[PDB]
Structures are given as structure tokens and as C-alpha cells.
Amino acid sequence: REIITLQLGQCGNQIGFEFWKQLCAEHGISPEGIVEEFTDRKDVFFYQYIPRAVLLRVIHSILNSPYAKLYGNNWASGFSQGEKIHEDIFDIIDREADGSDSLEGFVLCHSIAGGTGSGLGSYLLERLNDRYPKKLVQTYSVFPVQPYNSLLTLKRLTQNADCLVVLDNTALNRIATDRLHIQSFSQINQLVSTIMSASTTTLRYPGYMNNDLIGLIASLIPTPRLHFLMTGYTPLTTVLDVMRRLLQPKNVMVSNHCYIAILNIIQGEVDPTQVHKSLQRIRERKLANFIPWGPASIQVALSRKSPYLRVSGLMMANHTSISSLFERTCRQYDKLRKREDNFDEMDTSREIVQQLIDEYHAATRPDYIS
């Protein structure tokens, strides 16, 4: 069960290469895509070694790197181009699907703010649901005329992408100043790659459960509407030490309210006996609020750090506070609507996202059902 990855837009093509140079480094893979001498299951991302990538000016910058053998700005303008290269790119996609044994999902890296992303990323999600109906489409989208590109795209991600992880540049640029002291794009991307890498740790190493993308998402998303997640990377030592740093909003890249379900990923060699002791004290302290309506639990998983390269940690959070970020955007959208062929598609898009923010604000009530 392999996952074909697609990368669109400048931001998407840039983070992917930094995600690729990170992944092949964790394994014994030379930049020439050849194994070096120097158990780790490597089939999920590599084909027999070539990564199952489809990259879509910046391409020249990639081929000039020593990793060469590894393989306008308006929403309307980006879409029009898509329909014109409709047939051209799908043969690239289709041939990769038939080549794989049992294709499972579609990882996509794109930015709503990015024009090409706001035009070409949006078009694929409708076509991907049309051609292949039984394939999950999960995207590592990243939030930043600017509000327009954002809200118009959110209209597609709420009905096409059955999963999504948001990465806000505002909080990322903030974290860069306080604990990294940078002031560029070339520095903040270093931490972005760390998130995507540890996000797919349990899949690349043989474990007991979590052997597919479905094995991670299904516990998080209960309903087709509540399909937005958040990440948190603490190390920038026991099992109880790492969790107390996760729940602090000082490290989560975000700018009543309660979670839905938590997934914890530990990449260290900690003694797995005291993890049940850590959870007990957490329930005693009551550090995070939950939903009363439905049964939920806090989960944790273990794995092994790359030996060829100490405890790290990544958390997957499903919080209703993420709705506020939408409101801020849609608020600015209404601000530009009253100041400036049909101008109607942008009207229905504002209405459908109203349901999403409504669903989350109604989710934090004891009567979210019906």
C-alpha cells in the first residue's frame, strides 16, 4: 500500500525537496538514489530506488542541486491553465497508479496563498474525486487579493480533501524569532520538513498497528465535516517529560474550546512501561479539556529514530480553536467585498464555509448531535 505524492506551487515544490532530502537521509540512500552500505521498511515512499513524486522556474533550481538524479497570481488565472493541461498531466498520474501494487492515498503539498496553488491545486481536488473515488486525498496545506485566494480554496478542501493538516506561516515566523533568532524562507523550511518527516514515522518502520495512512486518520476524524488537524513538535528524559510540553500552546503552531482526539508519536527508546503512569497524572492534573458527548481517548505510539543519523516528539491535535483562523480570513474577505463574469461562485463559497465554522462552534456544546 504505497502513497503517491504530488507537489504544486513554488511553496509546495520547495517543502517537498526539503522533505525528500530529509527522508532519504534517515535511510541509507545516497543523493544518487543508490543504497549505501553503512529492517527499515522503505517501500511506502520509494519504488524499486526512486521516490514516487510528481513535481509541477523552480524546477531548474532542483536539477542544479547534486540531487539531480533523484527523479499569474489570480485564482481565475490558475484554474484556466489547469483545464488546458488537463490531459497532459493525468497520464503522468495514471501511469504511476497502475505501476503501484495497491495505491492507497495521495499526499499533496500546496499553499492557498500561492497563486499557482490557488488555481491548480483547487482544480485537481475536484478531478481526483471524479476519476478515482476510493482514494483518500490528504494535503499538507499551509495558510499565509490574498484573502480571496485563501477562502476560494477552502471551499474545495472542505468537500474534496478527506483530511488536512494546516501550517500557519504567522506562528512559524514567530517561532523563528524567539527560539531560533533568524531576524528567510530558506531557514523556516528546516522546521517544516521536521514536521512532515515525523508525521510519517510509524509507517516507515515495522510496528504493531499504524501500518497505513488510514491507521492514523480514522481515529481523529469522526464526522465528514470535522476534518482539520494540527501538529506540535516539542524538541527544539522520560515519557512524562515529553507530554507536558505538547499540551502547552507555546509550541503548537497556532495563533468553549476543547480537542477531539490526540495522537502522540514518540521517536525515542524510552521504557514503554511507565507510559501508563504518565497518562494517569495527566488525567489527574486535567491539563486539556475534552468533549462530553462522544467517547474519545488520548493515544500514544512508539517508533525508532533513524540509526544512521535522545528523545523527540510529535503530537497530532484536533482542536476547535482552529475555527478562529478561518473567521479571521473570512472577516477580511467581507472587508474587501464592500471596498473592492457572474461573481457568483465566490458567493456560494462564503456560504459553505459558514457551515464549517458553524459545525465546530456547535461541536463544543453538549448537544452537537443534530
Binding site: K277, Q280, E284
Partner: protein, 218 residues
């Protein structure tokens, strides 16, 4: 040989030292969780109004010393001790309006003085002598006697065996004032009770058998 392997380890002596240590630090965190039930919930807490029967596992080489009817007495003093830690901690965790504070010091003192008496003057006096005695054990039998002469005396100094409804109940009923006053956070009707039961306590204990005077000052 048995006594030899009992200092550590069939170290019977080493096992005995741990016994009176895991009750009578560590047990502070254990009870504090109970302040804020289930029978399995406690176990994971431990492994981390008057019930909580506690037991232990003893190997055959020391089974003859720490008998079965010996566990209950060790359990008896543990139950009563917690109720003292309870009232002591309940009136401590918090921090005619200010008139309540005068009822605090007038009370937080009294329970505190009693706690200073049971633990230090009794649960540490005989304990210091008992260790100095067992280290000179020279017999299978007399080791039982020096031990049995440690419980049956510590159950007497700590008044729990007899004269319960005559003396012990007084400390018990005034302990209910530590519960009632803790929740509320009628006021005049408390000192009328408090100044009565406390005077009832001294005017009853005044009969002092002699070691009771170490607390009779207050």
C-alpha cells in the same frame, strides 16, 4: 542463618524494616490523590470513611514472625493515622469575616498537637528502641516476643484498644469538626460546641496511664 538472610533479602530483618516504612516521602503523594472510590484505581496509584484494608506478601522463612493476626494490627494503626493526616492536611491546603481564622488557629493547633504526639512521641520512641533490640536477637522465640512486645504496647499508648467510648470517642467526635468546618468555605454555634468538647476532652482526660500527660498540656 535465618536472621542473617533477613537483614537484607531470607533476610527477615530487612523485610521487617520496609514493613513499618511503607506506612507510618512516599505515602504523602499516595493519600493526597485520595483527597480529591474504585478498588483498582488505588492499585495503580499505590504502585506509582474508615476502610482501605492493606496487606502484604511475606515468604515462609519470615511468615512465622509476621503472622496473619499481625497484619491486622499493623493495618489498625495505619487506618487511624490517615484520618489524622486527613484532618491535618484538610485544614492546611487552603489559605465577623476574619473571625473564621480565629477558629482556624484555635483548631489547626489542636489537631496538629495531637499529630505531633502520636508520631513523634510514640511511633518514633518505641521504634527507636525496637531497632536497638532486634539487632541483638539471639533466639527463634524471643524474636517473636520482642516483636509482639512492640505491637501490643504501641496499640496501648495509641489509645485504640479499650476505653474507646470513654476517651477515644471524644477525639473521634471532635474530628468531625475538622470535616464540617472544612467543607464550609452557624459560625457562632461552632465555638459553643468547640469550647465544650475541647473542655469535655480535658475534663475527661484529667483522670491521668501516666504517659497521657505529654499531651494534656493542650
Amino acid at each position: 542463618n535465618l536472621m542473617q538472610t533477613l537483614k537484607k533479602d531470607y533476610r527477615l530483618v530487612e523485610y521487617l524494616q520496609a514493613m513499618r516504612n511503607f506506612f507510618l516521602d512516599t505515602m504523602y503523594d499516595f493519600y493526597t490523590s485520595i483527597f480529591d472510590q474504585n478498588v483498582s484505581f488505588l492499585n495503580v496509584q499505590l504502585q506509582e470513611l474508615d476502610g482501605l484494608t492493606l496487606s502484604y506478601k511475606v515468604p515462609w522463612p519470615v511468615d512465622i514472625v509476621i503472622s496473619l493476626e499481625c497484619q491486622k494490627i499493623y493495618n489498625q494503626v495505619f487506618l487511624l493515622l490517615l484520618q489524622i493526616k486527613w484532618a491535618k492536611y484538610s485544614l492546611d491546603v487552603l489559605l465577623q469575616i476574619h473571625r473564621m481564622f480565629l477558629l482556624r488557629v484555635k483548631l489547626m493547633h489542636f489537631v496538629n498537637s495531637l499529630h505531633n504526639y502520636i508520631m513523634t512521641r510514640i511511633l518514633h520512641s518505641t521504634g527507636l528502641e525496637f531497632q536497638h533490640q532486634v539487632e541483638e536477637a539471639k533466639d527463634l522465640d524471643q524474636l517473636i516476643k520482642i516483636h509482639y512486645r512492640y505491637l501490643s504496647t504501641i496499640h496501648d499508648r495509641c489509645l485504640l484498644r479499650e476505653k474507646v467510648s470513654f476517651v477515644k470517642e471524644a477525639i473521634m467526635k471532635v474530628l468531625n469538626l475538622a470535616l464540617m468546618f472544612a467543607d464550609g468555605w452557624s459560625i457562632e454555634k461552632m465555638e459553643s460546641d468547640f469550647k465544650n468538647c475541647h473542655m469535655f476532652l480535658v475534663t475527661i482526660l484529667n483522670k491521668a496511664f501516666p504517659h497521657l500527660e505529654s499531651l494534656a498540656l493542650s
